[PDB]
RNA sequence: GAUGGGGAAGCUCCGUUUCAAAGGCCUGAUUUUAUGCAGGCCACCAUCGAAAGGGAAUCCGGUUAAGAUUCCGGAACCUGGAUAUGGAUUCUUCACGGUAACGUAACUGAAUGUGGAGACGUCGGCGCGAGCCCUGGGAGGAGUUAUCUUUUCUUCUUAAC
RNA sequence: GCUUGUGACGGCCCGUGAAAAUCCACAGGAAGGAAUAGUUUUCAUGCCAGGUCGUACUGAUAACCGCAGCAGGUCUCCAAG
RNA sequence: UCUAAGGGUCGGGUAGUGAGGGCCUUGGUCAGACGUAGACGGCCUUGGUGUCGCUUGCUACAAUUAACGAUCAACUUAGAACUGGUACGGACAAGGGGAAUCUGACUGUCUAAUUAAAACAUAGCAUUGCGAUGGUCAGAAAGUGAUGUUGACGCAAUGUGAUUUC
């Protein structure tokens, strides 16, 4: 079930560093150590190699992304706006 | 999707072959040129 | 190797030159990952490597187009005059020939405000918020520097600070 | 809708799922239409287009990746390319989509 | 061609097949020894 | 239905990968010896060297040499093209029974070699006699 | 050290131009828990390699010993 | 219970000073220095260990024959045959695109 | 850390590739001017600095008062060079086989371009191998035996290549 | 089981963990090469040669440093029941 | 002194047709050099160790009891009787524990030889400056050197030093 009520992945830090700091570290840590889907082959085979570098286990593609998650919201919106205004350049 | 689109421009294009007009001629292999 | 754009030449001034991304690698002391991009030397029959700063979305095996008439896609570098209103660039050249000076840190970019009639000038909003006018011939990579959100994670440990700052030139631990 | 006509074809006609089966069908001259995921590698896309041009077969690019195409066809696995061998009930062959 | 239809040889049957191959190869090597022995008279 | 005799394909697997062959006999059903859809094909192992105006007579004669080969090929190991090449000059020599005899392979290769050399000297099918750069 | 199997190759090798010395070695062994039998090793000394031929038949070994060249110098045991 | 020593003068457990223990015809244990293990050569495109190629230290390749170092195919000793197949297909389709695109360009500039 | 340069009254200093004429290579009856070298090709800067990093290749047995992977005996390997015989190949000149992964005793190659190896952090468990440890039978040697113990100890090994 | 080597994996990093000599291969094809005759020293065999300097012994409560032949200090390998 | 539990490897058939491998008990033809002896060996079996069998092709419950048997091996656990104690982790090895107050968040750090902290550092916290014709510094000044393989998620200086709550 649940070995830890609240602390979660932050259980390796014990009682140290303070509750608020452990909470702040928790979300980014969960993002970082997670396994993400691959946009190129469609498999959940993408893991971080270093902060910003994400590699797919299958299809062996390395992509650049966020420090602790594959994509950032800023990058997603920049991608979408580039698409939109280049379409309007065409039109 | 955009990576695939990036490749499409340089490699063989079925849409461009269809736009060329002659289709069955190309299927029979009527146009041939040598480069390099 | 330093992270610099391609040296300016006729191909990038008028048409486009196509390179391919070979690897996306980690640079010691730098937050942003680097991209190795191989181009064909227009004069000599030999391949030339370049070390760009990877933007978010750049991936191995991708085609990167550099020049005035290259597609407005993330990863492609363009003269600022070739891009429309409101675009977002990275590694922006301050002036033609410097090979990139603005918005090089992770998660940072430069927005385009508007162009100029009288000459080839463009104005831009820098990450801090300043509004600067550079030569419209200055190049930039489309997109945002990869590795964003890095500063959001607390270090939590003097040891993590030690490992971070031993690679930099900043003196650690600090005195005075 | 495109998903609805694909569902009708899957529930009524003949289809093959996968690159090797669709290439075999194109080689044997059995296919009518090939639906190709937007996520497919560009080399495979161009090769499939060349095969379909040689076999006089229509090519439609599905909007979405392997997961989307698989779940649209109605399977629980990712599907990259579908070949339509018979569309006796559905009218997907003639529609502009 | 016909479909795969799965199925499997287990462990014991594979052991017996390997044993038969070893016995056959042992006899083949004995025959090779006989061939090496025989030609001595002819060469002498 | 386009894999037939006379079609030109590109070998993509095997020792002759990257060469251009012409299909002399397609067995879509297969056979007992090759239980897969295959094709008897004839191709060029060594392309003739590209000559120019300057080259002398002996130089041209020695640079227009072609080494052919004959092989049974799985369909999955062919990249079929849109081009056609007249196979009638060796349909009789290139057959199923030829591949069972190393000497018959040799004679059939002689036939295919002289046919391809005649076509190249006549100037036909310069793409088929052109080498792929990959 | 190399083991040679063909008797024809062994004889051609013993007639080779660089070969001067050979050795005949006698071993007492058992065949499949059987009676104590004789094994004759012929070791021809080449420039690079010593070539060993193992014969398990005493009569064949004797006849080969007769078949050896005269100029070759043989060391027994 | 027999204890051994390094036989060269390097007294340190370095990467190039690794030993094994072997029993000799004299019935004693002895150290035997072992060379570094060889690495399989890798494909020039994908980086996978290409098969049919011997695994030797770099200087040792100068001693073996050609057959040990190559396979009988284009790019035999350098690429892994799936990369070769993709290279062939890409070259062919690049040529085909050139033909079609040139025809289209000529017709377009005719009708433009 | 020199040279090229530039400083400094000077002993010398700065800098490590530049603001240097920084050196190699191919062809020629360059068809006339009659005994004077012509036409071309390619780009980069010393050197030192590790007996623990990288790195060609040797093992066993024996031998001395004191030597030993170095001597002795036997058995190998590396590098460079000259070359001959066999094999292979060739009148389809520069090999055939295998659908394929690929195979083999070989199976020509200058410029030029490119790739691999060298060549790489730390921790955890899992699998496998080697030496050692423990142990059974049998063939030997030694100890114990006041009483008991088919017993206690020990030899039965195998290098590079 | 112990020591050690090794394989396929997993974890950690805002830390992602040398270079060069050197050897091989690929692409290319300047060329050269056979019929009462050629080629191939990346197959086998055969021939020749390998200079200079270190090499004994200790490595520590007797061989080094502390004015000593000091109850001190000084890197590392093997490791039985 | 017992009891219970925890494993490995091999095991499918005869009812049934007929051939295949090997010293083929005895019996049959061809037939091997050396020192009265003479093996091995180049050929065959319906037999043998209703005509056993070591082998494939197969009908016949192939096993829904292989839910069992033959064979091999290691040390762990749990429990129950009995039994001697002035003692049973018998030597060795090996935490004293608790209730309140002050202090520093912590891990860490320097005083080699009388001063190891309440001081230094630390992640976090806030402020301030800098877009290259720039900032911080070194330097009296410079064809001023570095930071700089640097570009605001950066560089640097300040002051407070975990975190929460009141
Ligand atoms: Zn992927
Ligand atoms: Zn590959």
* CATH number of the domain that residue D80 is part of: 3.30.1330.30
Whole-angstrom distance, CA of residue D52 vs CA of residue D32: 9
Burial H1-29 (b: 16+ CB within 10 A, else e): eeeeeeeeeeeeeeeeeebeeeeeeeeee
How many beta carbons lie within 10 A of that of residue H86, not counting itself?
19
Cα(C82)–Cα(C68) distance, integer angstroms: 6
Is residue C158 within 8 Å of residue C31, measured between CB atoms? no
C47 contact to strand I (CB, 7 A limit): yes
Q: Which residues of G are less than 8 Å from E39 in CB distance?
A: 7
Q: What are phi and psi of H12, to 5 degrees?
A: -115, 150
CA of G42 to C1' of K119 (A): 89
DSSP strand pairing (C110-115 vs C121-125): antiparallel
Q: Is the CB of H49 under 7 A from strand I?
A: no
Are the CB atoms for F126 and B34 separated by under 8 Å?
A: yes
Q: What is the 3-state secondary structure (H, E, C) of chain H?
A: CCCCCCCCCCCCCCCCCEEEEEECCCCCEEEEEECCCCCCCECCCCCCECCCCCCCCHHHHHCCCHHHCCCCCCCCCCCCCHHHHHHHHHHHHHHHHHHHHHHHHHHHHHCC
Q: Please answer yes or no on whether A67 and C149 come within 8 Å at the CB atom.
A: yes
Q: How far apart are CA C100 and CA C3, in angstroms?
A: 8
- β-partners of residue G10 are none
In the numeric block, which tokens belong to residue D70? 């698989």
Q: Contact F82/F2 with Cβ under 8 angstroms?
A: no
DSSP class of residue F48 equals P
Which residues form the domain of D1? 1-97
D54–chain B Cβ distance below 8 A for any pair: yes
Phi, psi dihedrals of residue D59, rounded to the nearest 5°: -125, 125
Q: Both tokens of residue C137? A: 């011939």
Give the closest ligand to the alpha carbon of residue A40. Answer: 1
> Are H70 and H99 within one domain?
yes
CB of D49 within 8 Å of a chain B CB? The answer is yes
Q: What is the 3-state secondary structure (H, E, C) of chain C?
A: CCCCCCCCCHHHHHCEEEEEEEEEECCCCCCCCEEEEEEECCCCCCEEEEEEECECCCECCCEEEEECCCCCCCCCEEEHHHCCCCCEEECECCCCCCCCCECCCCCCCEEEEEECCCCCEEEEECCCCCEEEEECCCEEEECCECCCCHHHCCCCCHHHHHHHHHHCCCCCCCCC
Contacts of residue C50, defined as CB under 8 A and 6 or more positions apart, other chains included, come to: C4, C5, C6, C19, C36, C37, C38, C39
Check residue A33 and report its DSSP letter: T
Reported in sequence order, the residue ranges of A1-91 that DSSP labels E, i.e. its strands, are: 46-50, 53-56, 62-64
Residue C163 is encoded by which pair of tokens? 């490992």
Alpha-carbon distances, residue A24 vs C31, C146, C150 (angstroms): 20, 22, 13
Using C1' positions and the CA of H63, the closest nucleotide is J42
What is the CB neighbour count within 10 angstroms for residue F126?
13
CB C96 within 8 A of CB C135: yes
Are H47 and H79 in a shared domain?
yes
Q: Which two tokens stand for residue C148?
A: 């964003």
Task: Output the CA–CA distances (angstroms, integers) from residue F106 to F74, F99, F102, in the order listed.
Answer: 22, 10, 6
D75 touches chain A (CB under 8 A): no
Four-residue CA torsion sign, A19, A21, A23, A25: negative
Which residue lies nearest I156, CA-to-C1' measured? H27
The answer for residues whose C-beta is within 8 angstroms of residue B23's C-beta and 6 or more apart is: B17
Judge B/C contact: 3 or more CB pairs < 8 A: yes
How many whole angstroms separate alpha carbon C88 and alpha carbon C111?
5
Taking the stretch 142-161 of protein chain C, residues with Cβ within 7 Å of any atom in nucleic acid chain K are 147-152, 154-161
Helical spans, DSSP H, in chain B: 2-10, 14-19, 24-28
Q: Which stretches of D1-97 are DSSP H helices?
A: 2-12, 19-28, 42-55, 66-73
Residues 4-43 of E with CB under 7 A from strand K: 11-12, 15-16, 27, 34, 38
H7 closest-nt by C1' vs CA: I69
| Sign of the alpha-carbon torsion through D35, D38, D44, D45 | positive
Contact D49, D59 (CB under 8 A): yes
Nucleotide nearest to F114 (CA to C1'): I92
- Which 8-state DSSP code applies to residue A36? B
Evaluate the CA torsion angle A63, A65, A70, A73 in order and state its sign. Answer: negative
Find the domain containing F27 and state its range.
1-134
**Which of C35, C88, C106 is facing A78, going by the closest CB pair?**
C88
CA distance F131 to F20: 8
Inter-CA distances, C167 with C1, C108, C160, F10, Å: 16, 22, 12, 54
Count CB neighbours of F43 within 10 A. 23
* Cβ partners under 8 Å of residue C173, min gap 6: C158
Assess contact for A44 and A50: CB atoms under 8 A.
Answer: no
DSSP string, F118-133: HHHHHT--TTTTSPP-
Q: Is D61 on the interface with B (CB under 8 A)?
A: no
Residue F128: name the closest of B29, A22, E7 by CA.
B29
Number of domains present in the structure of chain F: 1
Cβ count within 10 A of residue E12: 8
φ, ψ dihedrals at C5, nearest 5°: -65, 180
Q: Which ligand lies nearest the alpha carbon of H49?
A: 2
Check if B1 contacts C (Cβ < 8 Å).
no
The chain D residue lying nearest H94, using CA atoms, is: D46
List all residues 6 or more positions away from F131 whose beta carbon is below 8 Å from its beta carbon. Answer: F47
Whether the beta carbon of C61 falls within 7 A of nucleic chain K: the reply is: no
Phi and psi torsions of F27, nearest 5° = -110, 90
Give me the number of domains chain H comprises: 2
Domain count, chain D: 1
Instruction: Count CB-CB contacts under 10 A for residue A8.
Output: 15
* Tokens matching residue F25: 């006999």
In what side-by-side order are the strands of the sheet with C34-40?
C47-53, C34-40, C16-25, C63-67, C77-79, C139-142, C88-90, C110-115, C121-125, C131-135
Token reading at C156: 């939590």
Same domain (yes/no): H29, H42 = no
Cβ separation of H85 and F10 shorter than 8 Å? no
Q: Which residues of F touch E1 (CB under 8 A)?
A: 30, 35-36
Packing angle between helix D2-12 and helix D66-73, nearest 10 degrees? 50
Contact at CB, E40 and G11, closer than 8 angstroms: no
Q: How far is CA F118 from CA E16, F58, F115, in A?
A: 59, 17, 5
Helices (H) and strands (E) in chain G, counts: 2, 5
Domain hosting H92: range is: 38-112
Residues H81 and H55 in one domain: yes
Q: Do H97 and F24 form a contact (C-beta atoms < 8 A)? A: no
Q: Are F57 and F73 in contact (CB under 8 A)?
A: no
Return the H-helix or E-strand segment holding E31: helix E12-43
Q: What is the resolution of this structure in A?
A: 2.8
Separation of alpha carbons D26 and D3, rounded Å = 23
C-alpha triplet C120, C121, C122: angle, nearest 5°: 135
CB proximity list for D14: less than 8 A, separation 6 or greater: D84, D85, D86
Q: Determine the Cα angle at H14 with ends H13 and H16, to 5°.
A: 125
d(CA G11, CA G9): 5
Question: For helices E12-43 and G58-67, what crossing angle results, to 10°?
Answer: 40
Which residues of chain E come before a gap where C and the next N are over 2.5 Å apart? Answer: none
Question: Are residue H44 and residue H12 in the same domain, yes or no?
Answer: no
Q: How far is the CA of H88 from the centre of ligand 1 (A)?
A: 23
Is residue C142 within 8 Å of residue C84, measured between CB atoms? no
Decide if D39 and B6 are in contact by the 8 Å CB cutoff.
no
Q: Residue written as tokens 């979305």?
A: C57
Rounded Cα gap, residues D34 and D48, in angstroms: 9
User: How many angstroms separate the CA atoms of C13 and C67, rounded?
Assistant: 6
Please state whether beta strands A46-50 and C88-90 pair in parallel, antiparallel, or not at all (unpaired).
Answer: unpaired
Query: Which secondary structure element, helix H or strand E, spans residue E13, and what is its range?
Result: helix E12-43
Tokens representing residue D50 in the block: 């060349």
Q: How many whole angstroms from its chain centre is CA C121?
A: 20
Q: Using the beta-carbon criterion (under 8 Å), do E44 and G5 form an inter-chain contact?
A: no
User: For residue C17, which phi and psi values (nearest 5 degrees)?
Assistant: -115, 135
DSSP category for residue F36: S
Whether D53 contacts F81, CB under 8 Å: no
Instruction: Indicate if H22 and H69 belong to the same structural domain.
Output: no
Q: Could you give the maximum distance between any two Cα atoms of chain A, in Å?
A: 60
Q: Which residues contact H48 (CB under 8 A, 6 or more apart)?
A: H42, H80
The two beta strands, G50-55 and G2-3, are parallel
Please, are residues F75 and F12 in contact by the beta-carbon 8 Å criterion? Answer: no
β-bridge partners, D83: D16, D34
The residues pairing with C131 across neighbouring beta strands, listed in sequence order, are C125
Find all residues with CB under 8 Å of C138, minimum gap 6, and list them: C79, C80, C92, C93, C94, C95, C96
The CB-side HSE value for H67 (13 A sphere, CA atoms) comes to 0
């Amino acid at each position: 079930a649940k070995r830890t009520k609240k602390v979660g992945i932050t259980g390796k830090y014990g009682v140290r560093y303070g509750s608020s700091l452990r909470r702040q570290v928790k979300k980014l840590e969960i993002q970082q150590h997670a396994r993400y889907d691959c946009s190129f082959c469609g498999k959940k085979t993408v893991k971080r190699g270093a902060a910003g570098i994400w590699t797919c286990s299958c299809c062996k593609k390395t992509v650049a992304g966020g420090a602790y998650t594959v994509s950032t919201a800023a990058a997603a919106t920049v991608r979408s706006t580039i698409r939109r205004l280049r379409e309007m350049v065409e039109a | 999707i955009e990576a695939a689109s990036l490749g499409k421009e340089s490699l063989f294009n079925l849409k461009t072959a269809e736009k060329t007009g002659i289709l069955n001629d190309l299927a029979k292999g009527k146009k041939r040129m040598i480069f390099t | 190797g330093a992270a610099k754009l391609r040296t300016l030449d006729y191909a990038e001034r008028h048409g486009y030159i196509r390179g391919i991304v070979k690897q996306i690698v980690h640079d010691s002391g730098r937050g942003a990952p680097l991209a190795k991009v191989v181009f064909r030397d227009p004069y000599k029959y030999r391949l030339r490597e370049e070390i760009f700063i990877a933007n978010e979305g750049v991936h191995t095996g991708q085609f990167i187009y550099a020049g005035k008439k290259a597609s407005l896609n993330v990863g492609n570098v363009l003269p600022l005059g070739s891009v429309p209103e409101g675009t977002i660039v990275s590694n922006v050249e301050e002036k033609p020939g410097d090979r990139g000076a603005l918005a090089r840190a992770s998660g940072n970019y430069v927005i385009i405000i508007g162009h100029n009639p009288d000459e080839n000038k463009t104005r831009v909003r820098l990450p801090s918020g300043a509004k600067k006018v550079i030569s419209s011939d200055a190049r930039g990579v489309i997109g945002v520097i990869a590795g964003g959100g890095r500063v959001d994670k607390p270090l939590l440990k003097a040891g993590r600070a030690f490992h971070k700052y031993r690679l930099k030139r900043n003196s650690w631990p600090k005195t005075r | 809708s495109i998903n609805q006509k694909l569902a009708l074809v899957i529930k009524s006609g003949k289809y093959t799922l996968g690159y090797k089966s669709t290439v075999k069908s194109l080689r044997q001259g059995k296919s009518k239409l090939i639906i190709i995921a937007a996520n497919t590698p560009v080399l495979r896309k161009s090769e499939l287009e060349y095969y379909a041009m040689l076999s006089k077969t229509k090519v439609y690019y599905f909007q979405g990746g392997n997961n989307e195409l698989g779940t649209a066809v109605g399977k629980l696995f990712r599907v990259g390319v579908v070949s339509i061998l018979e569309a006796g009930d559905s009218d997907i062959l003639t529609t502009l989509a | 061609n016909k479909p795969v239809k799965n199925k499997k040889k287990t462990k014991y049957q594979r052991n017996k097949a390997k044993r038969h191959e070893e016995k056959v190869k042992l006899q083949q090597e004995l025959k090779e020894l006989r061939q090496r022995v025989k030609d001595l008279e002819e060469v002498i | 239905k386009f894999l037939k005799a006379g079609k030109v394909a590109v070998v993509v697997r095997g020792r002759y990968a990257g060469k251009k062959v012409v299909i002399v006999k397609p067995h879509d059903e297969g056979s007992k010896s090759h239980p897969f859809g295959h094709a008897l094909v004839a191709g060029i192992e060594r392309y003739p060297l590209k000559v120019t105006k300057k080259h002398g007579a002996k130089k041209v004669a020695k640079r227009t040499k072609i080494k052919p080969f004959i092989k049974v090929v799985n369909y999955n190991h062919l990249l079929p093209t849109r081009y056609t090449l007249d196979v009638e000059a060796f349909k009789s020599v290139v057959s199923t029974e030829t591949f069972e005899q190393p000497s018959q392979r040799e004679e059939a290769k002689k036939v295919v070699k002289k046919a391809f050399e005649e076509r190249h000297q006549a100037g036909k099918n310069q793409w088929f006699f052109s080498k792929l750069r990959f | 050290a190399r083991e040679i199997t063909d008797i024809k190759q062994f004889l051609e090798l013993t007639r080779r131009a660089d070969v001067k010395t050979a050795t005949v070695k006698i071993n007492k062994k058992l065949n499949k828990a059987g009676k104590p039998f004789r094994q004759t090793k012929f070791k021809v000394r080449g420039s690079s390699s010593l070539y060993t031929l193992v014969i398990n038949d005493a009569g064949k070994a004797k006849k080969l010993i007769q078949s050896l060249p005269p100029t070759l110098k043989v060391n027994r045991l | 219970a027999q204890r051994v020593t390094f036989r060269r003068r390097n007294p340190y457990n370095t990467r190039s000073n690794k030993i094994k223990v072997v029993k000799t015809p004299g019935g004693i244990l002895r150290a035997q220095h072992v060379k570094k293990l060889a690495t399989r050569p890798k494909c020039g495109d994908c980086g996978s260990a290409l098969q049919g190629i011997s695994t030797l230290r770099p200087r040792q390749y100068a001693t073996v024959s050609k057959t040990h170092k190559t396979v009988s195919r284009a790019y035999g000793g350098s690429r892994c045959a799936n990369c070769v197949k993709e290279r062939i297909i890409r070259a062919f389709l690049i040529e085909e695109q050139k033909i079609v695109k040139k025809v289209v360009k000529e017709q377009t500039e005719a009708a433009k």
